[PDB]
Structures are given as structure tokens and as C-alpha cells.
A paper describes a structure:
Agmatine amidinohydrolase, or agmatinase, catalyzes the conversion of agmatine to putrescine and urea. This enzyme is found broadly across kingdoms of life and plays a critical role in polyamine biosynthesis and the regulation of agmatine concentrations. Agmatinase belongs to the family of arginase enzymes and exhibits the characteristic 8-stranded, parallel β-sheet sandwiched between 3 α-helices on either side. As a metallohydrolase, agmatinase is dependent on Mn2+ ions for catalytic activity, two of which are bound at the active site in high- and low-affinity sites to serve in activating a nucleophilic water molecule for catalysis.
Here we describe the high-resolution X-ray crystal structure of the E. coli agmatinase, SPEB. The data showed a relatively high degree of pseudomerohedral twinning, was ultimately indexed in the P31 space group and led to a final model with eighteen chains, corresponding to three full hexamers in the asymmetric unit. The protomer of SPEB comprises an α/β/α sandwich with an eight-stranded parallel β-sheet between two sets of three α-helices. An additional α-helix runs roughly perpendicular to the plane of the sandwich structure. The hexamer has D3 symmetry, with very little structural variation between protomers. The RMSD for an all-atom superposition of the SPEB protomers onto one another range from 0.162 to 0.181 Å. In the first two hexamers of SPEB that were built into the model (ABCDEF and GHIJKL), a pair of unambiguous spheres of electron density, presumed to be metal ions, were visible in each of the chains. The last hexamer (MNOPQR) also showed likely metal ions at these sites in each protomer, but the density was not as clear. As such, these regions were modeled as a dinuclear Mn2+ site in the structure of SPEB. The metal ions are octahedrally coordinated by a pair of histidine residues (H126 and H151), and four aspartate residues (D149, D153, D230, and D232).
Numbering used by the authors:
A (entry chain E): -5 to 303
B (entry chain F): 2 to 303
C (entry chain B): -6 to 303
D (entry chain D): 1 to 303
E (entry chain A): 2 to 306
F (entry chain C): 1 to 305
Write the structure that this text describes.
Amino acid sequence: LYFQGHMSTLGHQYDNSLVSNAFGFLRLPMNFQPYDSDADWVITGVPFDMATSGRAGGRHGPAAIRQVSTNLAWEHNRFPWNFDMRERLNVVDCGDLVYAFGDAREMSEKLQAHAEKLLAAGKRMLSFGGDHFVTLPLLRAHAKHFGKMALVHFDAHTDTYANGCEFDHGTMFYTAPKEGLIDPNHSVQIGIRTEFDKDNGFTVLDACQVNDRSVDDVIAQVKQIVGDMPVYLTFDIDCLDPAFAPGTGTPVIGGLTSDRAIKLVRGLKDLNIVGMDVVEVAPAYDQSEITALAAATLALEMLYIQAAK
Amino acid sequence: STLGHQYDNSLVSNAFGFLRLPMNFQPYDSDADWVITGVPFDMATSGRAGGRHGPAAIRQVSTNLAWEHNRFPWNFDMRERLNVVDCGDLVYAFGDAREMSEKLQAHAEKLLAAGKRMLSFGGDHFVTLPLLRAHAKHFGKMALVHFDAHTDTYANGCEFDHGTMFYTAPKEGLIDPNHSVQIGIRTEFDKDNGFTVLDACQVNDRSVDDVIAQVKQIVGDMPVYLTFDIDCLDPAFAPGTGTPVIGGLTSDRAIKLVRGLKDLNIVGMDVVEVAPAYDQSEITALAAATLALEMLYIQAAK
Amino acid sequence: NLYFQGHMSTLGHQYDNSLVSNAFGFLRLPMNFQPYDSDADWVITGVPFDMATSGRAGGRHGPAAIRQVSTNLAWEHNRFPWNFDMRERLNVVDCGDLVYAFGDAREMSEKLQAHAEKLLAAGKRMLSFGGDHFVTLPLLRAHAKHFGKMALVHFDAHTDTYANGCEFDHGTMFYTAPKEGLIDPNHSVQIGIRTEFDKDNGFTVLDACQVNDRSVDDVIAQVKQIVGDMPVYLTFDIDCLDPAFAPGTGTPVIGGLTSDRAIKLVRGLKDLNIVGMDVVEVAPAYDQSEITALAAATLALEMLYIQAAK
Amino acid sequence: MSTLGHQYDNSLVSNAFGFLRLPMNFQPYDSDADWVITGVPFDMATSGRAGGRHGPAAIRQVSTNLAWEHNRFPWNFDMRERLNVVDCGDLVYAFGDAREMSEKLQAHAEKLLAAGKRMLSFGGDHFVTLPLLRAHAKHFGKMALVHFDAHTDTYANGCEFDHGTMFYTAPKEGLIDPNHSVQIGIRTEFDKDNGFTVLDACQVNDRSVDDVIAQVKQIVGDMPVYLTFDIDCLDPAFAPGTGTPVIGGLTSDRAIKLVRGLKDLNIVGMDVVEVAPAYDQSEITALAAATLALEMLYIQAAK
Amino acid sequence: STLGHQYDNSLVSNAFGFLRLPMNFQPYDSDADWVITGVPFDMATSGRAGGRHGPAAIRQVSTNLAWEHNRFPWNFDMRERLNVVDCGDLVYAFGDAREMSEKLQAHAEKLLAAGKRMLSFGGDHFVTLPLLRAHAKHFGKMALVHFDAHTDTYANGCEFDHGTMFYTAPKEGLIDPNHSVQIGIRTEFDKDNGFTVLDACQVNDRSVDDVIAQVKQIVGDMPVYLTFDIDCLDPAFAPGTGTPVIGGLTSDRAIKLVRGLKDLNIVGMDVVEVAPAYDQSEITALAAATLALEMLYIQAAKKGE
Amino acid sequence: MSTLGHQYDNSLVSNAFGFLRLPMNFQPYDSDADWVITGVPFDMATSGRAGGRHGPAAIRQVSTNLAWEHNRFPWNFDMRERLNVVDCGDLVYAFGDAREMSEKLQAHAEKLLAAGKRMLSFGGDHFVTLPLLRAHAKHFGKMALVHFDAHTDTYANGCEFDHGTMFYTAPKEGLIDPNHSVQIGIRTEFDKDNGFTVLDACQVNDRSVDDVIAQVKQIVGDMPVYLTFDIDCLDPAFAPGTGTPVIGGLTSDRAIKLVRGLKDLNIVGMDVVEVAPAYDQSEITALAAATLALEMLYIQAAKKG
Ligand SMILES: [Mn+2]
Ligand SMILES: [Mn+2]
Ligand SMILES: [Mn+2]
Ligand SMILES: [Mn+2]
Ligand SMILES: [Mn+2]
Ligand SMILES: [Mn+2]
Ligand SMILES: [Mn+2]
Ligand SMILES: [Mn+2]
Ligand SMILES: [Mn+2]
Ligand SMILES: [Mn+2]
Ligand SMILES: [Mn+2]
Ligand SMILES: [Mn+2]
């Protein structure tokens, strides 16, 4: 009942409402010292958007994902699954990373040291952004513990820009391969629909072709691409068409549906995913929490494919 | 209709009754074939409230549809085949859910006993239960065609719970689950009842024509009650609802499905869970309004 | 008076105590789409028109928004702070919205003037909902023929005395109205003005800067003096209110009146002989939680109460 | 210690959980708390717009704007130095059952008061105040009501669960004394010949802060006070996020100054109600409620 | 077109001309191949107004696209092939629709005569009628490739009505209905007027290639005027529009259907009916911005390297 | 004019480019301008909500509501007739590099002031003012700060790029004299024991505009004044579009009257900061900022004569 959500309400009463007792993601228990806990998975918020080239507001993403997640908490077995992920995984929400707002360098180092300490304690990580730069420190900690990783990357942009400043949310996947964190030749970038480089190692499955092909065919290609490398899964929510995810800093039309998106994440269940994150929710631009809702449903789906093991 | 009873070609002005249809606040002894009733109720919601403003938002946006003499893609005017009146909204003591339930059933029972039929606007989905209780008394046991992200077959809810109507309605002999279909479902459901659950995942993958064919086989020749929860539509098309769930139907798939149910003997129908407080540029109200008009056009198709 | 109190404006003719449902006619007053031969003392007309706007359009939705939000004021049997019910003292019907070819401002002008003259020539008085402020000029033309030259009690951030610009221009009515002998500038006051105006015309401009500092009683005393004892036409542009209170308008100007000051000022005009009145420039596309519409509905209701006070 | 790694969060954004990032205590009855914050996610008794059920969460979320202030303006101490405040979460009741809410909130309130704890409560619609008054009156006896609202809510022929009937019922049950009670900001039809003293928005906006405050102190005398604040007391310009808005209301300046000047009153319990986030604009209603809520703890801390 | 003529790689700053292109308020005598004109006008609307803010909304949001050297999925920069200038917005007395109509045509005739081509941002769809009057003088009778939820072939109506241009234009001999296609229609339409209607229902169920294959067959060898009404897109993608109709196109299918008209002789074009007061997080304006950029790219593609 | 064909645009909508439809001058250093408007699209220093980067563009777009007034109320002349004002667009820095912003803004500010141009700057968060003070202090010497805000921003234990620290760093670096400086509208925890005179929101609301202006004039005396206006000085009802809102602020009425009354002061530079359009409601925050911006140009034109 602790690790379920029966235990994070007033008087520890099971809150059946899709509204009340909205604190931790999915009403999962708060543990602000997660390093010595009995958690299998530790949810972290990264309230950061200093590395944005478009709209800011990403700093409020972790809160929005948590707030809207009460819509999913009532499902004992989250559809369409035949078990409860809370019975299989012990998940805690450790709150948001504390850093000096206006110091991206302090954010970077403290986030890297946070992950390094979790991973060294045998805890796995589901992380909420924040702009997509937060994924770089996370990959620096993950590469140290799990080795070089295949990147499964849901996005409208490839973020492989070579001539940006240090704190730039469009330069993580130029920097990660350069530092030997990820292998481009085993990495896949799904839903791309902005200018990208073709003759790097990355396999780009653009939104045009992904919206035309079947989910099972895209999945089969992804399964082959990654091989047997440990996967880091990163979902930029601007992968979804702005009709489904208006609340992003860099929106691009001709994106994926929320249906196609959840089906693709659902289908990655057989892979070795060591870490994952959902980034770039900007609630200042969200409409009736639909962007936040997509991020939270995808976040819960990521936990369910780990529980599927 | 309008000031000076002048034909209003605008998509804006003289927004009163749904589709600028005549207001008849005493519709029981009227010449009407079909009666539009608003149920301004959301006390049985488990998610967001705001459903109480549902009927108003659906009426206001319906001016967008009114100018169409023949509504696309139909070859006739449904107003030339049906006398439809808008009888206003149910008056009940707000905060008294029991009084709502009693007054809605009596209203419906009085309408049906006058040989009138009912297109109802919610309001949360609990309003369907009083509507089913009255329809059952006049039309007997019914087949349920139920568009939704949720099955609403919960057995441990309080009396006024918008997730319990289709646990209670089978028990009360109002509907036959074995001839009932549930379309758009994408939240935890009990597989081991009579209902055929056509989940959003498969309905989005399958063809519209092969979904329709299967619905027809299930319902058979039973008289249908057509209930449309608007959170069936993906929050991208229907943000203005109390319990949104991602991975839902497009408005295109939704209208095509409702359009292809014309051959069924549909005795009653409603559109529920429109929450204008959460709606964006009236796109949810519009979908609810357009689907409601489609329901009158499939009745007119007879 | 049950018909005119809104006991017959709901399903089964049941009194709706809720601030939500049966939102049709303003304040749930009965719909009369042929109001000319009715028992109505006062007739409410929507003018869904914004073609004459210089800023944002969307004024055309003003009438509908004012009606929908007005259910918030219906539950009060005696509207505060009055000790009677205006619905029991006045027969008030809502005749709906003016039907005109959208994109034809001339037809709007002619049909509105024809509609108004027919109401006045039937012994009815008019409370009109805009729409942009140009709707006042057709209404002033109808009123001028029936009651004679009037005193304009004008609430606005703008004087709208522009002697240039095209015919269908919502900043020109009160240059045109004096020229056609519809109003007397000498007995006219413009309240809330905080945009460039002509000082040396006959109008008395009580700018928002001084109106915000001065007492209500003192502004009221001055307005009473300016009008004299001529018949008054009361036009209220909602953008008179600060954007804080009325964000839903086409031409917002900061440093406006509070809703508290505006409702008090109209309340203090009760002694004046107001022969016709309107509320204009509600643009619901730019409104925020119906706060502009609510202001327009309350002020419009106050205009009916200061007629009922007599 | 309500942040990751128990670090001091100087931002006005991060770690937005308990009100003002105060410690979460879901079993606060046997705790060390002087004051307990409860959320009541309820809006079934609403006559206008619903959406009050999200009130508690929106007040908590926006309260990150106020937490960075060690001495919240304009005070010369920290209320966390003098008071031990805890956020006990939201009342768990069956959504659709108004009776379950009422009984469980009274039981919650009665256990807190019997345990020596005092209650700041966020609504939710104003009906929640009656179960809270029922609890308070058992423990503290008959009370004076300092009531901020656009409405007097003294309706006599409403249904059981009506957010406009509490202050007909509360004198009827001997919970409050109208003769020592005041209703500040009323600008809607009210009954004149009840014991209540109504300081309507019209006279309050015209009169000075000091002369209004002095009159309120005269009325209450030395009676134990229950302070209740319906946010629609504020003008829709300042509080657009509410179920039943009325124009010609109080400014946030005048409102915070009135609450700040009630500090020498014997206030035994208080609440802030009718925040409806669905109708809010950039959280300014939530912020006003949240700021008023902290002000109420500071006037308690000043003692 | 930035402070100190520095390259602004941000998706935010220096949002003046469409895609930060140079402003040329007197473009007639310039080196321009393609001139962008804002027509801030919505007086002919029968639904909501606010289309007057369309051009500005399209310009502001266009910063999201400027950073792309080669706009996806193209293999060239359209700016390296076409000299493009934004000439600002048409200046007419607000409340005078005839002045707008006369000045928009007069402006259009001057550009065409000087050897400039036109990409025009609306504004309600009536702006297309004065444009076809200028284009039909310079290019003769044209084929209309029409993206819309409405056919706008309404006989009757007033003079200035955004649902009548394509009843008026054939009568005056600006367009040939028999070589004209109307894609995305999902409201009452006239079946026998020469126009080939491809309704949203069939468009959504058919393949992009097979619709493109048919559109080529219809327009023939005629010079094409491409007019995109943004309400062609489903309100889920284009909520900021005066007359929304449900069951529209995805932005995906829309850009895919335009992208596949690259071989057609498109002489002029416009994007209309963006009403920013009803838009949500600039998604309608962004669709209008992205589609406008695509229209320049199918001209940059059909023009050589 | 800055319109299609250089025509007079009397509309409050169209040709929305430079602030108040003033001419765009991207190289203003050698121009005939008296006053230059610069956008600083930067919000990286914020401790609350971000969005300030879009502030400059929002202020420009809303300023069309003010341009039609030849003599802006309640003035008896045109500032555009007395002052030569240009908009030089927005500062171009690598987004995510706060250091580059600071250095490039100072160098830009020093170059303008070295050429005899005066600065009206739009933020962006309030940190942008520290680079501006460094530049002004080099050309004018130590200045009296007239500072409208809900916050004093004198925090001594923040990171380098922090929007709540400028007026601790500024007096330390000899840019401003606290003893001749005033902070108007404060309603948050503040240090009382610094040289600054704090006129908190509660007292300013209770006092007459006359007696407050009288106090400010005495404090500054005859030192060169830098007028910096954080828009959150206004109550969130008037300015919801801000990053760190605080209830119980000034009305837009009181705020303009207070600025209007500073006309006799020697104000050498000025800025308006912390407009976050993501949190604005029907542009009312941008309008207030744009109107207060225009008022600052009028009190300069008034003093100039
Ligand atoms: Mn990314
Ligand atoms: Mn991205
Ligand atoms: Mn349902
Ligand atoms: Mn449902
Ligand atoms: Mn006016
Ligand atoms: Mn005006
Ligand atoms: Mn109340
Ligand atoms: Mn109240
Ligand atoms: Mn069209
Ligand atoms: Mn259209
Ligand atoms: Mn500041
Ligand atoms: Mn500040």
C-alpha cells in the first residue's frame, strides 16, 4: 500500500478522484532522500529552460506532469496492460533538483552528481524536464554506470548542432557521441521534421514516413538498429504535432498523434532501457493540460514497459 | 428564431435554441417529433466539473451549422423531415443531485408518453441513467452504442457517480450488455461482462467501414440508445471535457462512425461531458454540436 | 408580471435560481422576436456588428456574451443596492439580434434605424447591446426624430469626434451626430476620456485622470448641470473601464475607471430623463473569464433600474 | 526539508508541493504542529460555475512566489520561527457524495481541535465552512464571524448542500452570533433585519482602511472569531478565478490591509474558499488567496 | 534584418518581416522575385472577425522556421534561389471595404507589371478576389487550386462577402471552374458548377499521391492560382479561424498535398482566414507560416539551382 | 513612413513593426536619432516564470493602439516632432549564453552613448539593466536610480546572472548612489539599512501622487537619473504578464501619473522590463508597458521643449 498511492493522502485513504491529493507523480510517495530508499525507480524534476532557443517556460514542466498525472492514478492496471506497475516496481518521486536559477553550470554539475549517486545506489531513473539540455548531464552519469548507450530519441529536431554555446538544448547529440556517451550507429531519431544531417551515424525516421508506416514496422526497424546495446530513451514532447502538444518551446507542424506515440513507446517493451526522460513541456503555452497529459501518460507507459520485464 | 423572423445567413447572430430551432418551454403538447433538452449537471464528476455549462456552449456554437440548408454530406434538409424544438434546460435545485435525477426522468417519461423522441445535451454522463430509466419504460430493454474513453461499469461508486451508469443500467434491466458496443475505450475496463469493447487503439488502426459492420452485427435489430461521451475524441479535438485521455478518435473518424449508424433503429440519444471552462476556441462544443446534428440527420435518413 | 419576470423563460415555466441554466434572453427576460405590438415598456436589441472598428474586431459576439453572463444577476429578486425589482415595475422583452447581410454596413445602418423608429413609433424605449460604437449613430438618428435633439451622457476612453475617416467609422459618430442635429454638444459630457481629444468643441470632457481622483457625488452634480433638463441618450463604451476590468474590447487604454466607480456613476444618473441607452464595444474573443461581459450586463441592468426608480 | 537533498530552494518555481513548501504530514493529529493546512476539493454545492475542487492545489502551486520571503512583507519576523505549520493534504471523500464530504471534514476538524491543533483550510466552495464551524463551535463555543464575500449566504430555503445557506444554518445551530458578526464586501441582495452588520463593497471602497477596521473590532468585541474569506470578495479584475463573480469589489491592496489590521482579534480558526482555477488568469486569483492565507498565519504568529 | 546585421539563430528575436526577410515598403522597383503582402481585413466575414491580425501573427511565429538553412525536407535554401521581400501591410480606411478592394488590386497590378510575383497573407478570403482581378489581367484566365472547408460559390450575399469570390471570379472570367479543384470541403456545396470538389471525408481516406495525381489532371496546362483557407485544416490543428468545421485535414496531410504540387505552374498564391484572437499557442499561425514557406519552396524547386 | 507605399496608417492594427510605427534603424550609431529603442530578448536570470524574452516583440505589437494619437493624452505636443526616435530591433546573442548578452548589450549601449544617442530599452528580465547601468555610468558618471518594482533586487548571495541582485552589484561598482536613489511599489521583504529610500506599495496607494513625486524629486536632487520600471510594480490585475507577480500593487492610473510627474528630472537613460507575454491577458501588460514607455519619451520631449 506504500509504493501504491494508498499512503500519500490525508489519513492514508485511497483517493479514487481524478483531482485531489496531487503531490508526487501518480500520487507516488515523496522521498527527498531517495539514495538509501527501497526504490527500484526514482522520478526527478529538472526545473530548467535557460538553454532554450525558442519559448521559455520548460521550468514548470515537472509540476504540470505531476499535477495532471492524477487523471491516470485511478487505473489499477493502466490500459491496456494486464497488471499494476506499482505492484512490480517500487517508484518514489524525489521532488525537483535545487540549483541557483541563472546558473546553468551549477544545474549541470548538480544534476550529474544527483544521477551518479542514484545509479551508484542501484536505482534507475525516470526524469522530467525542463528543456532537452538536462538529458546531456543525465547521459554523462548513465554512460559511466552502464557504458556507451543506443539513444532512442523522440523529437521534431535532431539536436546535433556543432556550433552552439555550451548551454544549448540543440547540441546534446553532437556532444554525447563526441564524449562517447552514445553510439550514433545504434541510435534512432523518430518524428524528425526540421533540417537535419544525413551522413552522421544516426538513423532518422522522419514524421512524414512515420505517419505513413505501421507502428509494428517502425518498432521492428528500431529493435534491429539498437542491437543489444543498453538503451537510453528520451522523449521530447514536440515529437507530438502541436495539435496534441501545443505547450512546447519549439513547436513544428506535421507531427505524430498521441495514439501513434503511445503505441511506439508501448512497442519498445522488449529492449534493455537503463534510463529514460520526458522533456520540453512548457505549461505557459499548454491548453487544458493536454501537453502535460501526453507527457504523464508517456511517462507512465515508460514505467509499464520496465514492469513488463 | 430571429428579430422580425428574418432569415439569418450569419454564423454568429441570433444564437438562442440549438441550430436556431424554435424555443418551446412546454414541448409536451407541441407538434415536435424530436425534443432537445439541456441537463446543466456535473455533481457526479470524478475529474473536472464545468459540464453544467455544456448545453449553452453547444447551442451558442451551433450557429456555425445553421446556414447549411442541406448539412454535408446529406442530400436533404433534416428540418423539412423533422419538427425539432429546443425546450430549454432542466430546472433542479443545484446541489440536489437526487432532485435532478427525479425531475429528468419525469420530464423524459412525459415527453415519450406524448410520442416525442429526445436528443439530450449534458452535463456529466450520469444524466444518461435517468434518460435510460424513462426510455426503458416506453421502448423496453435497449442496445447501448456508447462512445467514450471510459466504460463506466464501476460497482463501488456512490449513488451519483458518472462512472457507474452502465453497471446500474444492466442490473435495472434497462439495457442488454450482450448487444451493447463501447467505442473509443482506452482506460482500464472489466473484460468479463457482456459488452463488446472496441478500444481506441484498434478503432484508430482498423477501417471505419469494418468497425460499422461489426457494431451492426452486435446490436442486431434491438432498439438502440446512442450515448456519446465527448472525451471519446482525443483531447486535441475535445480539450473541453472533465476527464481527458490521450490516444482518442479524430473528429473525422467520430462523425464517419455516427454517420454509418443510420440503418440502426435509434429510439433516443445524447452528447455529454462538454466542459466549456476547459474548451479552446469552442472546438469541443462544435464537435458535440456537429455530432448532435449528425444524430438528427441519421433519424431524418429514415 | 410573471411572463416579464422570467418565470416563463425556462423548461416547464419553473423559476431558475441557478446562475447557469436557461441562458437565452438577457436576465432570462422573455424572447419577443416581434416586439413592436407587445406590452413591453423597454426592448433589448443585440447589434452583432464590428465592421466599423479601427482596432480589434469581435464586437459582433458582444450581445451573446452579455446575455450568457447575465444569469449571474437574475437570482437577485431586488438587485443590490435597490429595494425594489425592476422586472415588476418594467415590462422588458429581448427581441434578439438585428438580421443584416454580414459585410454590408449600409444595410445594418438602414435596418437598425428602421427597427429603432418602429419601436419608438410603437411607444417602446430601447436598451441596445453592441457591437462597435458606430451602432449608436443609427440609434441617435431614430431617437432624434422622436424625442428631438438630446444631451449625450457618453462613457468612453475616446471622444469619437474624428471629422475625417470613412462613413462606417466607430470614432466619428459624435462629429456626425451634432452635424445632423441629433445631439447638443453644449449639454453633452464625455466621461473616462484618456486619449487625445478636441478641447474647443461644445462637449464637456471629464478625463479619467480627474474622474479617478474626484468624488462620485461631484462628477454626478456636474453631469446634472451640463445636461440641464433636455432628454438624455446614455451611450456606454465598456473601454471606459480600465483593461483590468474590461480586457475584452477592441481599443483598450490604461488608466481607466474601476467597475465600482462606473456602476456608482450610472446609479447617480437616476434623476435624469434618459429616453434611450446602449452598452457597446464588448469583444468576447479578448474577454478573460467573462469579466468584461459581466461589467456590461451589470451596468445595462443598472440602466434599467434607474428607469424603474421613477 | 521539503526539497531534493533537503536544499534551500531560493527559486519561485521549484519543489511546489505543500503550501509555502511547508512539511507534508498526512497524519498531523499526533504531530508537533501549532497550525494544520487542509484542502477540501469540493464544488457540488455551487449555484454558479463549478471548478472550486481544484482550489487547494492552485493555492499550493502558486505559493512558491511567497516562500522565498524570510520575513514576508511587511512583517519584522518569520511566521515559521514562531508557528510550526504542516500541510496534511486534501480530504479524501467519494466524489458525488456531498454528505460523506461534510461528515468526514467535521470528523477531521474535531480530531485536529481535540489534539490541540488549529486549522487553516482551503476550499473548494463556501459550504465547507459549515462543517468547519460545526467542529470549531463544539471546541471553542459560539463564535463571531468576520466574513469576506460579495454575498451574505444567509438563504433559508436552499437544499441541504447549498454554498449560499451556511450563515442561515450556523446561527440556527448556535455556531455563530450574528450580533458580533460582520460581512465585508457585500454587493448582492442581502437580508437587512438579521443581527449581521453588512459593510457593503460600496462603503468599504469609499471609507478608509483604518475606520473600517476600528468598526469591525467594535462589533466582534472579545468573542472568539472564525475568519472566512470567499475570494469573490475581491473584484473580478483581481479574482477572476471564482464560480460567482460580482463587479465593484475590493482591491487586493484594501483586502490584505483589512486582514493585516485584524491581528489583535482572538481568531480561533480560518479558511479561504471559492478559488476556481479553471476560470483563473495567470494564477492571480490563486496568488491573492495564497497571499491572504499567509497573512492569516502572520496575524496568528504576531501573538 | 537584425541589430548590427548579425545572424539571429534564435527562434524568438528580431520578428519583423516574414522569416526575418528584408522589409521593402516600395517593392515595385526592387530586385525582388517574390513580394509578401499583408492584407489586414475581415469586414467580409460571416462568422468570427479578427482575421485583420492574420499577417502579423504569421510574421511573428515565422521565427520558428528561419533557423533552418534547408527547410525540411528540401535539399536547398529557397533564399539562395528567390529574392524575397516583405512590403508590409495594405493601408486602407478601416470601415471602407471598397477602398481595400480597389487599393489591393491597384497594388497587385503594379507588382505584376514590374515583374514581381505575389505571396499574400490574409485576412478573410475576400482579399483573393481583388488579387485574381490583377492576376487575370497579367496571366489571363487561371486554374484555381483551392484548399478550404467551404466552396465559397454563394450566389446572392452582399458585395463584400468572404463566401462569394468563386461565384464572382468565374463570371468576370478570372478563373475556369472546369480546370479548378476545391480540396477539404465538408459543408453544403453546389455539385454542378464545373468545380471538381474533393471533400475532407474522401481526402482523409485516400492516399496523398492519388489526390496529387488527380489535381494535376484537372488543372491541365493552365497557369495556377493557389489559395489556402486555413480552416481547410481540422480545428484541432487550426482553431484560430472565423468559421471552423470539424473533420478537417491534419497539418501533415496539408503540407504533404501542397509539397506534391511542385511541378504545377503556380503564378500567384495566398494563405487566408488566420484569426489570432481564437488561435492557441500560435499553432494556426504556425501552420499558415509553414505552408507559406512551403509555397515559396515549390517555386524555388520549380525554379533551378 | 514604415508602411506599404509609405502611407499614413490611422488603424490600431496594421503595419505593426517598430515601436509606435517608428522607423527601423539596425545601424543607429551614425543616424540623426536623439533616442534609440533596443529590445533585449533575455529571461535567463529569472527566479520565477520565464517568458520575458518575448517582451520586446509584445510591446512593439501593442504600441499600434498609441500611434494614432498625434498629441498623446494628456500632452499638448507630439514627441515625434521634438525627438527623433528609431527602433534598432533586438540585441543578437547566443541563447543560453547570459555572459554574451551582458557584454554585447554593454558594448551596444557604450557605442550608442559614445555617438550621443540616448537609450529607451525593452526587456527581458531586470538583469539587463546592470549591463545598461555600466554603459551609462562610463558616459554620465554615478547616477540616482528611480526604480519602480514590487522587489528591491539587492540580494547579495545570488549567482552572477540573477535578476534580483543588480542594485547590490550596481552601487558596489560605483554606477548608482543609493542615498539619491528611490524604490517605488515594494511589497516584498527588503533591507531597510541600505542608503535606498523604499516607498512601499501600501503607503504609495494611501498617499497622493503629488506628495510622492515631491519626495522623489528631493531624494534625487540634481544627480543624473536612470529610470528603470519593472512592470510587476503594477498589481497583477493590471500586469498579469510578469515572471514574479505580487498582489497589492499600483493601478496603471497611479503608475502613469507618477512617471508623468518625474518630467522635471534629468533622466539620462530608462528601460521597461519583466513583460512576459506567455502570462499576459489580452495584451493588457504589454499595453501598460508600451504606454509607460511612450510616457517616458513625452517627459523627455517635455523637458527638451
Ligand atoms: Mn529536443
Ligand atoms: Mn525538439
Ligand atoms: Mn462517460
Ligand atoms: Mn469518459
Ligand atoms: Mn467609442
Ligand atoms: Mn472607446
Ligand atoms: Mn459564497
Ligand atoms: Mn461569494
Ligand atoms: Mn474560404
Ligand atoms: Mn472556409
Ligand atoms: Mn525586478
Ligand atoms: Mn520585480
